[PDB]
Design a protein around this nucleic acid. Structure first.
Lengths: 87, 163, 93, 81, 102, 101, 93, 91, 83, 163
DNA sequence: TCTGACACGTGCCTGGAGACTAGGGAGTAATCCCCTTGGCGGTTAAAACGCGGGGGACAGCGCGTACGTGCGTTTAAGCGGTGCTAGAGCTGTCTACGACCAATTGAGCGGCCTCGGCACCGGGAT
DNA sequence: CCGGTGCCGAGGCCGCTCAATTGGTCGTAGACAGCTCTAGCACCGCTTAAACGCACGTACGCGCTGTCCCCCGCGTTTTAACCGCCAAGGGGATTACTCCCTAGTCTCCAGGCACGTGTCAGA
């Protein structure tokens, strides 16, 4: 059931993060920098395809950080080091 | 203010500590801990525009006035000659409700200042543009957290005080 | 001969606040390469930023936007507050 | 108005991203940390894109402006300009 | 007087203007851009110099060694976020330890 | 008969020369520089298109989808080192698994 | 309107090795931004490379050195071998 | 006591700013690495020390992250897998 | 024309030990000194080759400090104090 | 060769597999696994200059000839119009010793080719410019590893065969 | 078995190509030193090796608790289809601001003394 | 760290080529001004995948222990790292002039851009 979900979400190229939550998220973040600021409809999809690429590049390395410590389940201290080692 | 043509009615007052001083060009050094404050008074009457003041201004499309509660002001940004993030107020379409929505006020709208408190105006409760969640808290409790703490935590403070 | 460094200006701007503090020549070259790298960063950012708007000139707004892009946080705010004050004291003469 | 929208992306979405990354099991306390990472990441990227748009005297952040902001941060995106 | 004296700064306006014209950054160059650039890098040099002077006065020394510049850059948060990919000659390392060692 | 035909390539030499002149990369520009950049751009596009066509032939599809381009890039070694800080939209991720899972 | 891309040239260089394979418009924009990023990378490398020797003329030497600086491995070794073979046919005519 | 003069050496080399890597073996290493790129290629003596400082500041930044990866893995010693991870976490 | 037969062993084991004590490492395994020198070889094989292409772009024969600091500037490892 | 003025006596022969073909501009594609080979013969007599050949050339300062055993050749580098990394030989100041020292040969020095083997010349042992470590191995054992494997491992192969 | 987007002729117009000019930047030769490299003594500060040991690394275990998975269940996410309107990207003037040409001049880059704060010692408490 | 020579290295002092500064003058890219049309925002609704829980076994995280072995550390040897010093040499500068090659300006034209209708993927 698990590795079937890995094989499903590792072959298809769909939008993993939802569109309108990401829209509200980037609007809530950009409202502290410019009020009544519009977004291009391609720009939010570009932000989504960059954020879901950076998160997958972080997760595929914190999985290496988890299996380096002879464990399978990742932790908050795994991703803290996974960001802190390169960012 | 928008540009330097409209910035000819204010000057940069850079208070270092809680006392009112200038000490040159922003202490001549960038100093942590002692967070610098800037309230810009016009030379006509000396009305202060500080971090937590409630200014009155006519809207760009309505014409009817509105109160803006200043949350932050940033000296010499890119599009504007000084940026001002202020919290909006709810018009009754004389009681005025509070709103945690940030906006930006230009210099050609601001007319007078008015410390709106509970019983020239009267606050009743913090509200939202959706039309619910009336929390009967005046503005005196949040201005200390606005003036003492940077607004990165005061935003979540008045967002958690609502709902 | 003809090496346009930043030795004397850095030495003068050091002595206007802490006049009793010396500076080594290695640290002088470090600060020279430091201000040269920041100048190269801001100049390349302003060049790309003027190319991004199909413009041919670099005004003070271009360098101000590029230096709000490059420097992080409150240091950029203090930098643009120094720069705008200096150009308003310069051009208004 | 807009508040707590970082809970709009939920823990099954982070589960989907983690299955794409190639994990088997994840903890239940990593979701707030992943949201805190994403908040700073989107804060930096959105701030650079807002600076790029506010430079050009526009009032709409374009895909070209956000791909320039991602190019400047060493995360060069393709397919938009 | 020069443009630096008219601006109120101690850093060369004309040298920065010449380097901007000879650096192939644009065909045209505005008037406020070199004085803005000299003001910015003058403020940056002044801040790193006063932090290096603080690091020297915290070591009871006067001549700023490169170790003082390293300990002044890395102790500040925003300068280290600015100079994240930097390498300083004769700087050593931060005095730092983890709690899971002692 | 034209400049691109005299070079013998399928990429525009004149557009490369005009963009090099208008991009503020130098004051003067030699003759061999835009045709050299034209040749290396044509070679890079031809190699990435050949690898994308190999991915499309190995995936039984007649059109280059972005997944074919990302699989062609990440399956190669030197193209991944050239495009390490490159995130392709609508392409997902390279299929790989760890042995300790 | 009047926005130049490299769409027709990429289509023509695709249709002479794999003539039975189409290409999507999204992948066309991906390849256009890809070759534009490589173009501006080689251009911004050759600019700073010609600035290091106090020159003002970008030649085939400057772009060849910048493209053996940018492209890693034997890919640059095949790239300069194609580029010299093209410019000999160009300048020999 | 075992394991307390290692902290003394840590306190000695954290307060100091000298060159831990020797000059002449590093110079021979840089020369034998550039031997495959240009024969009879001479080096400026400032450039060798510049490469030594960049190598030193890269290696201590690798070793700090390696020790942090060992600390996160509930250990105080480091292994080859830690540096393999740190190279696969930094390209 | 020096026969420098594998001078990566010239970075001896106490040198990596001193670098680790500067980095804050309590103790090192014995299968690390063979790996750290390979990491150093892989790093220098990039940066020295970049500096050699930089200095042979300019038709020179000396690798000056400007060449290595520009090669480190391009790689995102920007050195100071040399140019 | 140094430049294009001296590169008018050779052409690019790009053999894809071990067989001798051209197939256009380096297979028109970059192909892994099938490592391409380049030996450049002059049009006067067809003398091959391959990966593992021993060419004869007069030195730039000595005048007396010397043998260079080609380890690698890189088409169209920056300073030279083609670069050639060749292993040097030890002159007796007719027996010639082998040397694992890389160097670069220009086109204005090379005269003839000579497959120097053990008993026009005679190899005795691999040696060094220090003057010791005579290992009596001919060149036929290393040319297969030179032609089959890339020289990144063949360098350590003949470095480990010495000492 | 169904259909719905992608690809071959289509006028053009405006950017690319050829030709004809000078000017100015690189490219040949040419000094001459200003940096290397190299090989000599030397001497000593780390480097190498051997052993003791003891403290951390690895492995098995057993208590267990947080987590994948199964099944309702909201419920907000995705698509559509409206209307509308804010502003992006145009054209057009001109105008204010910069590039470029001589003149000038202080200034800020090199020599040259002139001291002056850091080094590392006796040795003392750190 | 007291404190003493001392030292070698920065700090003023002089000073002289030279690029920063000023002044006209032209010319030319940005600033206003309209427009227009276009892509983005709001909202209601309609399905509807999917997030949100409760159980629930169960399987790995995690603490204990127990062994064991490998590296920390010290003590003796050793060997080349640092210094330095002379000497050779070679390439990095900087004229120099010139020449040829490319910017500028016409100049002709063609090519590659926007439709477009015929054609080819998917479920």
């Amino acid at each position: 059931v698990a590795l079937r979900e890995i094989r499903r979400f590792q072959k298809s190229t769909e939008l993993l993060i939802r569109k309108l939550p990401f829209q509200r998220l980037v609007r809530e973040i950009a409202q502290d920098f410019k009020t009544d600021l519009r977004f291009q409809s391609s720009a939010i999809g570009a932000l989504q395809e960059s954020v879901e690429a950076y998160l997958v590049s972080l997760f595929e390395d914190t999985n290496l950080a988890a299996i380096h410590a002879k464990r399978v389940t990742i932790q908050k201290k795994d991703i803290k080091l996974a960001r802190r080692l390169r960012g | 203010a928008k540009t330097l043509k409209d910035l000819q009615g204010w000057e940069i007052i850079t208070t270092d500590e809680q006392g009112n001083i200038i000490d040159g060009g922003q202490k001549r050094l960038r100093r942590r801990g002692a967070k610098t404050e800037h309230y810009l008074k016009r030379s006509s009457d000396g009305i202060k525009l500080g971090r937590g003041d409630s200014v009155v201004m006519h809207n760009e499309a309505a014409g009817t006035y509105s109160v803006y509660m200043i949350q932050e002001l940033r000296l010499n940004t890119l599009n504007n000659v000084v940026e001002l993030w202020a919290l909006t107020y709810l018009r009754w379409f004389n009681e005025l409700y509070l709103t945690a929505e940030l906006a930006e006020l230009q210099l050609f709208n601001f007319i007078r200042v008015a410390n709106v408190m509970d019983g020239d105006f009267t606050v009743r409760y913090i509200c939202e543009p959706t039309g619910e969640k009336f929390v009967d808290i005046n503005i005196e409790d949040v201005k200390a957290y606005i003036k003492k703490v940077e607004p990165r935590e005061a935003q979540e403070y008045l967002k958690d005080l609502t709902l | 001969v003809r090496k346009e460094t930043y030795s004397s200006y850095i030495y003068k701007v050091l002595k206007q606040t802490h006049p009793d503090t010396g500076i080594s020549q290695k640290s002088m070259s470090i600060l020279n390469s430091f201000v040269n790298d920041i100048f190269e960063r801001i100049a390349t950012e302003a060049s790309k930023l003027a190319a991004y708007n199909k413009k041919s000139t670099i005004s003070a707004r271009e360098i101000q936007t590029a230096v709000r892009l490059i420097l992080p946080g409150e240091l950029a705010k203090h930098a643009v507050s120094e720069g705008t004050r200096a150009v308003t004291k310069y051009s208004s003469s | 108005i807009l508040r707590d929208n970082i809970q709009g992306i939920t823990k099954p979405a982070i589960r989907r991203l983690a299955r794409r990354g190639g994990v088997k099991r994840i903890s239940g306390l990593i979701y707030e940390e992943v949201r805190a990472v994403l908040k700073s990441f989107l804060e930096s990227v959105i701030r650079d894109s807002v600076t790029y748009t506010e430079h050009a005297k526009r009032k709409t952040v374009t895909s070209l402006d956000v791909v320039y902001a991602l190019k400047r941060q060493g995360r060069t995106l393709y397919g938009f300009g | 007087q020069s443009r630096s004296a008219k601006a109120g700064l101690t850093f060369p306006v004309g040298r920065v203007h010449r380097l901007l014209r000879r650096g192939n950054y644009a065909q045209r160059i505005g008037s406020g851009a070199p004085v803005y650039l000299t003001a910015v890098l003058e403020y940056l040099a002044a801040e790193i110099l006063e932090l290096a002077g603080n690091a020297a006065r915290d070591n009871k020394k006067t001549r700023i060694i490169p170790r003082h510049l390293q300990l002044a850059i890395r102790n500040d948060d925003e300068l280290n976020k600015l100079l994240g990919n930097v390498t300083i000659a004769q700087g050593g390392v931060l005095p730092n330890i983890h709690q899971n060692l002692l």
